[PDB]
Enzyme design. Sequence first.
Site, short mmCIF file in Angstrom:
data_model
loop_
_atom_site.label_atom_id
_atom_site.label_comp_id
_atom_site.label_asym_id
_atom_site.label_seq_id
_atom_site.Cartn_x
_atom_site.Cartn_y
_atom_site.Cartn_z
N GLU A 1 51.17 48.71 53.45
CA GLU A 1 51.26 48.35 52.04
C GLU A 1 50.48 49.38 51.23
O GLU A 1 50.84 49.70 50.10
CB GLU A 1 50.67 46.96 51.77
N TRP B 1 55.53 41.14 50.51
CA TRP B 1 56.14 41.16 49.18
C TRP B 1 57.55 40.60 49.12
O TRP B 1 58.25 40.78 48.12
CB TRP B 1 56.13 42.57 48.61
N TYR C 1 51.71 47.97 41.31
CA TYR C 1 50.70 48.90 41.85
C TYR C 1 51.42 50.11 42.43
O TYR C 1 52.53 50.01 42.96
CB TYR C 1 49.90 48.27 42.99
N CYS D 1 46.78 42.00 40.75
CA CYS D 1 45.66 41.15 41.14
C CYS D 1 44.43 42.03 41.28
O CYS D 1 43.38 41.73 40.71
CB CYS D 1 45.98 40.42 42.44
N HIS D 2 44.54 43.12 42.05
CA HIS D 2 43.43 44.06 42.16
C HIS D 2 43.65 45.02 40.99
O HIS D 2 44.26 46.07 41.09
CB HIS D 2 43.39 44.80 43.52
N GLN E 1 38.87 42.26 40.79
CA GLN E 1 40.08 41.51 41.08
C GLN E 1 40.11 40.30 40.15
O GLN E 1 39.16 39.51 40.12
CB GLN E 1 40.06 41.09 42.55
N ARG E 2 41.19 40.15 39.38
CA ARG E 2 41.30 39.05 38.43
C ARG E 2 41.55 37.71 39.08
O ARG E 2 41.02 36.69 38.64
CB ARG E 2 42.41 39.33 37.42
N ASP F 1 43.13 34.96 46.23
CA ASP F 1 43.45 33.89 47.16
C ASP F 1 42.53 34.13 48.35
O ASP F 1 42.85 34.93 49.22
CB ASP F 1 44.91 33.99 47.57
C1 LIG Z 1 46.16 40.75 49.30
C2 LIG Z 1 47.33 41.10 49.34
C3 LIG Z 1 48.80 41.54 49.41
N1 LIG Z 1 49.72 40.36 49.37
C4 LIG Z 1 50.67 40.28 48.21
C5 LIG Z 1 50.61 38.92 47.48
C6 LIG Z 1 51.69 38.55 46.63
C7 LIG Z 1 51.70 37.28 46.03
C8 LIG Z 1 50.64 36.37 46.26
N2 LIG Z 1 50.66 35.13 45.71
C9 LIG Z 1 49.66 34.24 45.95
N3 LIG Z 1 49.70 33.02 45.40
N4 LIG Z 1 48.61 34.59 46.75
C10 LIG Z 1 48.54 35.82 47.32
O1 LIG Z 1 47.47 36.15 48.10
C11 LIG Z 1 49.56 36.75 47.10
C12 LIG Z 1 49.55 38.02 47.70
C13 LIG Z 1 49.74 39.43 50.41
C14 LIG Z 1 50.73 38.39 50.50
C15 LIG Z 1 50.79 37.54 51.64
C16 LIG Z 1 49.87 37.72 52.70
C17 LIG Z 1 50.02 36.96 54.05
O2 LIG Z 1 50.69 35.93 54.13
N5 LIG Z 1 49.37 37.56 55.08
C18 LIG Z 1 49.32 37.10 56.50
C19 LIG Z 1 50.70 36.67 57.04
C20 LIG Z 1 51.65 37.88 57.21
C21 LIG Z 1 51.16 38.85 58.30
O3 LIG Z 1 50.71 38.35 59.36
O4 LIG Z 1 51.25 40.07 58.05
C22 LIG Z 1 48.28 35.98 56.69
O5 LIG Z 1 48.70 34.80 56.82
O6 LIG Z 1 47.07 36.34 56.71
C23 LIG Z 1 48.88 38.72 52.60
C24 LIG Z 1 48.82 39.56 51.48
O1 LIG Z 2 45.61 42.20 46.47
C1 LIG Z 2 46.01 41.07 46.17
C2 LIG Z 2 47.49 40.87 45.73
C3 LIG Z 2 47.68 39.62 44.86
N1 LIG Z 2 46.78 38.48 45.29
C4 LIG Z 2 47.13 37.06 44.87
C5 LIG Z 2 46.01 36.33 44.14
C6 LIG Z 2 46.74 35.14 43.53
O2 LIG Z 2 46.79 34.05 44.46
C7 LIG Z 2 48.17 35.66 43.25
C8 LIG Z 2 48.40 35.83 41.72
O3 LIG Z 2 48.27 34.56 41.04
P1 LIG Z 2 48.44 34.45 39.43
O4 LIG Z 2 47.51 35.39 38.77
O5 LIG Z 2 49.93 34.99 39.20
O6 LIG Z 2 48.41 33.03 39.04
O7 LIG Z 2 48.26 36.98 43.95
C9 LIG Z 2 45.51 38.76 45.91
O8 LIG Z 2 44.69 37.86 46.07
N2 LIG Z 2 45.17 40.03 46.24
#
Ligand SMILES: C#CCN(Cc1ccc2[nH]c(N)nc(=O)c2c1)c1ccc(C(=O)N[C@H](CCC(=O)O)C(=O)O)cc1
Ligand SMILES: O=c1ccn([C@H]2C[C@H](O)[C@@H](COP(=O)(O)O)O2)c(=O)[nH]1
Lengths: 519, 519
Positions: free
Chosen positions: A292, A314, A340, A400-401, A420-421, A424
């Site tokens: 990524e 994604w 990004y 987010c970042h 980071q705003r 999760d």
């Molecule tokens: C940060 C960031 C980039 N992102 C992009 C991204 C996009 C939308 C989001 N939306 C929300 N609500 N939370 C997020 O953390 C989030 C993250 C991520 C998205 C999912 C996972 C995830 O499920 N990771 C593994 C499962 C997949 C794997 O094994 O590769 C896990 O369960 O840990 C990690 C990063």
């Molecule tokens: O590097 C990253 C990529 C995005 N997210 C997650 C954080 C939030 O759970 C979600 C965005 O939520 P909202 O701001 O859209 O509500 O994306 C991360 O934590 N880190």
Amino acid sequence: EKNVSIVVAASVLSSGIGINGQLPWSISEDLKFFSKITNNKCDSNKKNALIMGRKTWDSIGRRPLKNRIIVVISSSLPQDEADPNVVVFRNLEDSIENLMNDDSIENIFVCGGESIYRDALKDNFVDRIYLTRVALEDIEFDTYFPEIPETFLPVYMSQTFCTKNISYDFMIFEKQEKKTLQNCDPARGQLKSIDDTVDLLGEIFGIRKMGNRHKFPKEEIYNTPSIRFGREHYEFQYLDLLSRVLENGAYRENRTGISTYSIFGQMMRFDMRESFPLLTTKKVAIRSIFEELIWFIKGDTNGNHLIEKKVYIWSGNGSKEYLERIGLGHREENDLGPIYGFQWRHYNGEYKTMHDDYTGVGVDQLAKLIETLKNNPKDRRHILTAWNPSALSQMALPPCHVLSQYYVTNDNCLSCNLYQRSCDLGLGSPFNIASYAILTMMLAQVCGYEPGELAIFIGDAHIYENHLTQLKEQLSRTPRPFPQLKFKRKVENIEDFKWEDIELIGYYPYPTIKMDMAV
Amino acid sequence: EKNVSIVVAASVLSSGIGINGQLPWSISEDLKFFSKITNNKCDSNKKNALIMGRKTWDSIGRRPLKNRIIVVISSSLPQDEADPNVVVFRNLEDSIENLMNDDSIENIFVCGGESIYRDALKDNFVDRIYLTRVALEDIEFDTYFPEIPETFLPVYMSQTFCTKNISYDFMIFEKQEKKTLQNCDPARGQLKSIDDTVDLLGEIFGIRKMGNRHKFPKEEIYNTPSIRFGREHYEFQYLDLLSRVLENGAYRENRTGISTYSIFGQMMRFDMRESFPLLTTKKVAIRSIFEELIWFIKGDTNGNHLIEKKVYIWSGNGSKEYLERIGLGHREENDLGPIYGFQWRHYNGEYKTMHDDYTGVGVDQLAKLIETLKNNPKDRRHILTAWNPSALSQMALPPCHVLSQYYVTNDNCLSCNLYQRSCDLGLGSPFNIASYAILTMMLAQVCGYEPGELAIFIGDAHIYENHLTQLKEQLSRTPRPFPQLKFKRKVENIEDFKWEDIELIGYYPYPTIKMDMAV
Ligand SMILES: C#CCN(Cc1ccc2[nH]c(N)nc(=O)c2c1)c1ccc(C(=O)N[C@H](CCC(=O)O)C(=O)O)cc1
Ligand SMILES: O=c1ccn([C@H]2C[C@H](O)[C@@H](COP(=O)(O)O)O2)c(=O)[nH]1
Ligand SMILES: NC(=O)C1=CN([C@@H]2O[C@H](COP(=O)(O)OP(=O)(O)OC[C@H]3O[C@@H](n4cnc5c(N)ncnc54)[C@H](OP(=O)(O)O)[C@@H]3O)[C@@H](O)[C@H]2O)C=CC1
Ligand SMILES: NC(=O)C1=CN([C@@H]2O[C@H](COP(=O)(O)OP(=O)(O)OC[C@H]3O[C@@H](n4cnc5c(N)ncnc54)[C@H](OP(=O)(O)O)[C@@H]3O)[C@@H](O)[C@H]2O)C=CC1
Ligand SMILES: C#CCN(Cc1ccc2[nH]c(N)nc(=O)c2c1)c1ccc(C(=O)N[C@H](CCC(=O)O)C(=O)O)cc1
Ligand SMILES: Nc1nc(=O)c2nc(CNc3ccc(C(=O)N[C@@H](CCC(=O)O)C(=O)O)cc3)cnc2[nH]1
Ligand SMILES: Nc1nc(=O)c2nc(CNc3ccc(C(=O)N[C@@H](CCC(=O)O)C(=O)O)cc3)cnc2[nH]1
Ligand SMILES: O=c1ccn([C@H]2C[C@H](O)[C@@H](COP(=O)(O)O)O2)c(=O)[nH]1
């Protein structure tokens, strides 16, 4: 009385300490530690006594250790009246009487021998355990350190250190048993007057006293609770932020259907000089992370390329239904927009689709960053941003970042700051930490520096309610030393990095923990 | 033995405690405090004794205080065998024997009377002092609290609280005298095993152990050193960051000719619910701050308007020679460019000169911010940025307070997060803190909320070498309670705020400290 501490170095997973009469590794710092700790004494006129099995005595080369007294336990070896700094005893118990006299002997150290260790513990002769955890587990072992009895609890766990790419910890266990509950907060217990006053003041005012808005985590949600004043390992930066929201997080709804518990304005620190911040309390998908990152670096926004390399993070925020749902139904199946990367290599560029050739358009921050980093290191503007008020509406997901700044230390180390705003803590953070750690390392190799420190400042730090049992499970695992991550070659251009170029040395995490993302 | 604590509430500056037999103010929380503290006891079967002069006894209305025993010192008043909860004594010393028996009496409190206070101290009868500092100093006083003798030192200082717009603290002084140096770090001293290990580990590794890169401040540069575990007042967030760079700050050159001592990645927290974060250890030019803020809010970039209102902070970076020097010699005398404000109300707008009418151009973040704040409070994108890679070159100075995010608590409070890339702890910070605190308050009034918390994340936190003696002087001053800042009317539109609309209640800072800005 008189203290009896164990000093040992065992592999992180199986507690391996020996192979054919030799240490299964060579870390001078740990030997230096053993030396420092076993010599450390208050009375200049006294000496410390180091007890060891005969075999270990052979390992030392049967030559005394300076300023100390070696006590060999052996059935055969002669009670040589010769060397005064060395004495022999027929059984472990008998030797322990160093207490019973030789007031010349200030402290006692059980220095080794799976057998001697095991017996020391079995007969409850030891008060403390100085354990150096070495991170290399796929090598032969023939000697082991017994499992630490439950009467022992960890009170300190150092940060991770590197030596020849081998990671290792230093943690000490104390045989505490007495006393009831105890408060986990390390600020309390210093003097009742303060504690009492703050408590009272906390009853009068309520949520009005800011402190009551930042309550210290309850033991049941605090990782490895016994380490109260020695939570040095930087994985606690994450584990604690975890339990900290678990303690004060306000239940609140958001754009996805899954509510969260959140607190606002938090931070975590991570060293990168001696180790790589890849959480150990849960196996982390480092490859996906990496793929990524270069994706961003490249300036790519076509979500298929990730899917093609079997990286689906994604997918959710990239599907047809999601795009339709957010007024981007005109967008192709995975054209995430000026997200990004696009903002990194083409800031303010006029976005069309993920297929157009944006070469030359926008502001190439990444390029300038690298240039500024090496041509004017002490510069105070090494910044990279992804928050473009003008592009937001075209993005599948707002950054987010949001923004990161870079600093070059006087000793040529490269540190990083990320704001980071939204975070999760369950899914994002782990990825987020590793990701920016790597990016820093890359920026460093390319600019001729070495990794420094990584500091992350969170805005809305939250935990999705459906991650509660999972993160509880995770918080039950005691951290293992961080691994090491190295590049196998010096790339000429930052975008030439490939998965194959990375080496994850000594990563021994706990089993992965499944958690579902909120779209 | 048996403890003797003083409980008193005196004005911040002159220690005024009485006027015509009355408290010179009415704060129920403090009375509630007095009650909590003087009732607080370990033995259910014992009572606490409150000693007081006859005059105070008259003030109480000569009626007993529940669960306690009032001891009146008076030459005349009859030794009434009647009320058991009240007893009379002819002199202070004699009464103190509550120790000498009445094991029914667990603790002793000297509850008042300038005379009784003064005598208690003079005869060294008191162990502790619970002092409530009230922030109102221009009212009549006829009774005072004597100066605290040097044998007493402050060990705790609460955050500031408000009641009817009156600010106040709670701090306790203990009569400590024994013991030598002592380590200021509150993490040490918990158990030697840890301390020793970390020290040793710190010798082996050097700058390699991150901890050694973040050394705890030395006493000589630590503000009010005696408060080791009770640095609750949030002004220590600033004072400590001050001494923290003073301790680890790396000497380094920058674009101005004055070098600095800096560290990277720091943070400070400030409550805004019970007080306004306007540093007390130095008088701060709040008006200039304000006038610069609406200036930003308006979207103004014409540095003359500030000068016109006698605000010169932007003169330096606005002069003809400075502009010439940075390749903006074509710019008019004070046309600072697309700086803060222009980016706030016209993000990405094509800048010409400070005279053009940019109405309608760019992205009005401030507007959207306010709209989003009230229409979708739980939203996680309440962001405001000033970092525009495309505008940088036209700015007289790159944005220091780079990006800020806003959060609306479940209880309708508005908190703020600010990431600052570069921070002059000597001149900038003080202004910076107040500025963003105000902006939050404004945003709050306009959106129908109340101020929450302010968290600032610093990148390059530095101290200009020419501010060293000044900041040393500042660090020698013990903090006074923060003041209160209120708006005198509810503005309809955020840009209608005027200096006259602000009330700074109870600000009693130390004399201003002159420091020169580096261009
Ligand atoms: C940060 C960031 C980039 N992102 C992009 C991204 C996009 C939308 C989001 N939306 C929300 N609500 N939370 C997020 O953390 C989030 C993250 C991520 C998205 C999912 C996972 C995830 O499920 N990771 C593994 C499962 C997949 C794997 O094994 O590769 C896990 O369960 O840990 C990690 C990063
Ligand atoms: O590097 C990253 C990529 C995005 N997210 C997650 C954080 C939030 O759970 C979600 C965005 O939520 P909202 O701001 O859209 O509500 O994306 C991360 O934590 N880190
Ligand atoms: N990683 C680490 O921190 C350490 C690793 N090691 C490793 O461990 C291995 C050595 O340990 P291990 O094989 O257990 O051998 P040990 O050093 O315990 O020595 C065993 C010997 O001690 C004597 N002994 C033990 N128990 C008794 C008893 N109850 N009564 C009388 N004598 C006793 C016996 O000698 P005798 O036969 O002569 O009677 C026995 O053969 C080596 O590989 C060494 O490198 C050692 C120390 C630390
Ligand atoms: N802000 C705060 O925390 C507090 C404020 N106050 C204020 O202070 C004022 C009252 O204090 P102040 O005027 O000093 O009066 P005090 O309450 O000390 O009372 C003075 C009286 O105590 C008796 N007394 C004092 N010293 C002696 C002695 N050495 N030997 C014998 N008797 C003694 C005398 O009474 P006698 O003449 O009958 O012999 C004397 O008149 C009031 O305005 C009250 O509101 C009071 C407590 C706390
Ligand atoms: C932050 C910010 C905005 N700014 C803008 C601004 C512009 C360039 C800078 N350049 C440098 N090197 N440091 C700065 O802090 C700085 C700040 C400020 C600039 C000066 C003062 C200052 O000298 N303040 C008073 C003196 C003037 C007064 O009394 O009003 C002081 O001495 O405290 C404060 C804020
Ligand atoms: N944490 C730990 N590390 C060790 O290496 C270790 N080693 C043994 C046993 N034997 C060995 C053998 C030799 C030396 C040794 O030569 N020590 C010297 C030199 C140390 C140095 O400065 O390198 C000493 O001064 O103790 C140490 C341990 C038992 N417990 C340990 N425990
Ligand atoms: N910090 C401080 N505040 C005080 O008001 C105070 N007051 C006195 C003396 N007298 C007064 C007079 C009346 C009450 C009073 O009525 N106290 C009751 C009720 C408190 C409440 O709940 O409001 C008590 O329970 O003590 C307190 C102090 C002396 N030291 C003080 N010290
Ligand atoms: O709100 C503000 C306005 C600017 N500055 C100062 C910080 C730095 O001392 C200087 C910019 O330094 P460089 O980034 O240009 O090197 O401006 C502040 O601290 N805060």
